[PDB]
């Protein structure tokens, strides 16, 4: 049962290497999403800062401003959720690396037999 | 109209060296962007070194019952891990200040 | 340097003929084009050594 | 009296023209616009008449 046990561990290890490659690609995609949402915050808040330099009666409580406040709040919730997703993906990659090291050790000790 | 001559020379000088200050400010903003890019590259390189050292130590520590040995390289690896931790934290503090 | 020199040069112009003519918009395009060109040259220089 | 009302409309016209320039430059501001930067606390800071 050494031979087919070793083959089972070998199949598990090969597919585990595949799945870890996909999880690393997922990590980089979450990073790209984070940096683009940061640039969108930059654009919205620069527009809101420049807008309030108006003359005296032109300071107006417009629906544009009552929408820009919800703009900044919604992009804040977006970047918060994507940061949470980054932490969770790092945690799952940690668990995958643990399983990889465990089955590497078991592959070696069964291959000695 | 000499009062107007006074006022226009005065405001024109204000314009001119406002323009000078603006040019210097833009050039320093350029170099600030280049420095924070250098900081980010340094942080990811130090993260790679931490990966290498801690992978080496956890690959080493699976040794059999007789060869569980406290060599010099184990102590060196532990010191290296906490040294690169201190390095990484200092780089994030400099990033936030910049 | 020559584009910024011409942009600062065209601010000596007397107040009737201080103009936003065909020259001004093309000089603005020149400045942005030159900066885009040399930033992209810096990025492909970064690609080469890697 | 006619001169007074004409000057009132002229100062209001100056206010509208400057606000038009501000809202135009805000309207054409896209991403990759080469004029953006971070701003902190602007989501709370307002003067409003």
């Amino acid at each position: 049962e050494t031979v087919d046990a070793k083959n089972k561990i070998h199949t598990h290890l090969t597919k585990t290497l595949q799945e870890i490659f996909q999880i690393e690609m997922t990590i980089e995609s979450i990073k790209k999403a984070i940096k683009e949402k940061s640039a969108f915050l930059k654009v919205a808040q620069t527009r809101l800062d420049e807008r309030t330099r108006r003359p005296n009666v032109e300071l107006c409580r417009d629906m544009a401003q009552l929408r820009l406040v919800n703009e900044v709040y919604e992009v804040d919730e977006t970047i918060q959720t994507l940061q949470q997703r980054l932490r969770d993906s790092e945690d799952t990659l940690q668990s995958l690396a643990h399983t990889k090291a465990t089955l590497e050790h078991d592959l070696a000790v069964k291959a000695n037999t | 109209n000499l009062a107007f001559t006074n006022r226009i020379a005065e405001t024109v000088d204000a314009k001119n060296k406002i323009h000078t200050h603006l040019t210097k400010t833009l050039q320093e903003i350029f170099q600030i962007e280049m420095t924070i890019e250098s900081i980010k590259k340094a942080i990811k390189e130090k993260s790679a070194f931490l990966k290498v050292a801690q992978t080496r130590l956890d690959e080493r520590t699976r040794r059999p019952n007789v060869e569980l040995c406290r060599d010099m390289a184990q102590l060196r690896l532990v010191n290296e891990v906490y040294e690169v931790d201190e390095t990484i934290q200092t780089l994030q503090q400099r990033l936030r200040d910049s | 340097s020559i584009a910024t020199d011409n942009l600062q040069c065209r601010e000596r112009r007397q107040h009737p003929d201080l103009v936003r003519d065909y020259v001004e918009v093309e000089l603005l395009k020149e400045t942005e084009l030159i900066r885009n060109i040399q930033e992209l040259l810096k990025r492909t220089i970064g690609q080469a050594v890697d | 009296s006619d001169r007074s009302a004409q000057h009132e409309l002229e100062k209001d016209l100056s206010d509208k023209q400057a606000a038009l320039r501000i809202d135009d430059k805000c309207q054409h501001l896209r991403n990759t616009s080469e004029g953006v930067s971070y701003f902190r606390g602007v989501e709370r800071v307002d003067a409003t008449v």
Binding site: A39 | I29, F30 | E24, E32, E39 | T32, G35
Partner: peptide, 17 residues
């Protein structure tokens, strides 16, 4: 490629005319 991540802060400035 397209410089979609880096934004410098300046242009060739003239105000209003």
């Amino acid at each position: 490629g397209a410089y979609t991540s880096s934004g410098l802060a300046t242009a060739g400035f003239r105000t209003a005319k």
